[PDB]
Each structure stands twice: as C-alpha cells, then as structure tokens.
Design a protein around this ligand. Structure first.
Ligand SMILES: O=C(O)C1=CC(=C(c2ccc(O)c(C(=O)O)c2)c2ccc(O)c(C(=O)O)c2)C=CC1=O
Length: 223
C-alpha cells in the first residue's frame, strides 16, 4: 500500500490480505471518519521509509504512538520539529549525555537521523485516537508488528534489541538470543526511569555489540 517502503513491502505485504489486517484497516478508516487519529495516514509507516529492511541493525520496541497534536509521526519516541521532546525522550537524551562521548542535545526530538542508520523505532500499536492513549490497542496492530519482529528474528543476524519496560520485554520475549542481542531495562518514562534506565548505558553497549559482529556502529549524535 501507499507510503510503505519497497523492501519492507516485499517481505510484509503477505500480511495485508489476511483477514485480521483487512479488519484492522476498516477499523482505523472508520475511526478517522469521526476522530482525529495520530499519526496522519502518510506517517503511519514512516519506520519503513528510513532504511532498507536488511539494513536494520538496532530495534527499539515501543507501545502506543504519542496522542497529542503534532507529536507522533511513525517512529517511536520521536517528535518532528518544532515539537519539544516529551519526557520519555528527554530522559533518553539525558542517558545519552552520560553514555556517549560529547553527545549534544539538539533541542528537537526528531530521531530520523537514527532511523536512517538502521535503528528501527517500532511501536507495537501504530495508530491512536487523539488524546486517548491505548485507544487502538488489541485491534490488529499487535499481530502485525509481531510479524515484523518475527521476520527480523528469523531473517536478520546479530540485531540488537533494546527492550525498555514490561510491554517491550514481552513483545521481544521470543527473540533468539543466540542469533541476536537483547538488552533489557526499565522504561525511560519519568514513572520508571529511575528503576534501571538511568545508568543502563544501552547505547554504548549497542555499538560495542555491533562492532564485535563486524558492523558499523550507530552515531547516536547524528540527529
Ligand atoms: O508524554 C507524552 O506526551 C506521551 C507519552 C506517551 C507514552 C508513550 C508510550 C509508548 C510509546 O511508544 C511512546 C512513544 O512512542 O514515544 C510514548 C508514555 C508516557 C508515560 C509512560 O509512563 C508510559 C509508559 O509507562 O508506558 C508511556 C504516550 C503519549 C503521550 O502523549
């Protein structure tokens, strides 16, 4: 379908004709008739547009999109200019400031620079009704993003999965740990950031894992 990266479409378009996905599309379409639904249709699949599916090297799993105006744009945790970084992303930046040498908080919260380097920023649920968190849960999105995680698990090699919080750790609980790397900690949200996220050093740990497997590390400063 429209706005779906070609290499991603080549491997995942078998989901589109399945009954669960057809029903999911009808629900989202009906929701957009009566409510503002985030992100806009052309940004629901931004995570397929930043790099080829075979160039993915790091996977950060999220839950729900941001539900405020101009926030969500199809990459988890990210916000387009000139929206200020929400609290979870500010804590991510704060951890980077102690984890990565000379990291610079750029002021904005657009994580496209990471996505183009092969950092997949995948929410488990890809739409949300405006101002109503989790409103589109359990409608088909989870099964679809499960298929994405399952494809990467089976087809890629040496990925680093960053699983922050209980929801993400469950979604990635079937990842082959002999084939891929799994780092787990608390969610960077202010509700849980002091429960393990601060000090987790996942970003430097990710690059060491990448380099040891002969892959180019992420420049977390390139934003
Ligand atoms: O701060 C806002 O404005 C805001 C924040 C959230 C999230 C949230 C959840 C999953 C995500 O994937 C993302 C993302 O894509 O960044 C963000 C959130 C905030 C506090 C929490 O505690 C938890 C939690 O515990 O799971 C989650 C959602 C809508 C919002 O409007």
């Amino acid at each position: 379908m429209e706005f779906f990266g070609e290499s991603w479409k080549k491997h995942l378009s078998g989901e589109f004709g399945k009954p669960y996905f057809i029903k999911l599309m009808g629900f989202v379409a009906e929701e957009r008739k009566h409510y503002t639904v985030y992100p806009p249709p052309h940004q629901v699949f931004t995570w397929t547009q930043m790099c080829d599916i075979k160039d993915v090297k790091v996977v950060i799993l999220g839950q729900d999109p941001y539900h405020g105006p101009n926030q969500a744009h199809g990459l988890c945790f990210s916000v387009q200019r000139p929206v200020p970084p929400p609290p979870s992303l500010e804590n991510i930046y704060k951890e980077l400031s102690t984890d990565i040498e000379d990291f610079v908080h750029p002021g904005h919260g657009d994580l496209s620079g990471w996505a183009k380097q092969g950092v997949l920023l995948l929410n488990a649920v890809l739409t949300v009704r405006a101002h109503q968190a989790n409103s589109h849960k359990e409608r088909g999105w989870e099964q679809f993003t499960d298929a994405v995680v399952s494809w990467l698990n089976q087809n890629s090699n040496g990925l680093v999965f960053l699983l922050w919080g209980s929801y993400a750790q469950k979604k990635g609980s079937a990842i082959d740990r002999k084939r891929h790397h799994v780092l787990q900690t608390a969610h960077p949200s202010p509700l849980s950031v002091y429960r393990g996220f601060f000090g987790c050093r996942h970003f430097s740990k990710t690059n060491e894992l990448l380099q040891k497997s002969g892959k180019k590390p992420i420049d977390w400063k390139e934003l």
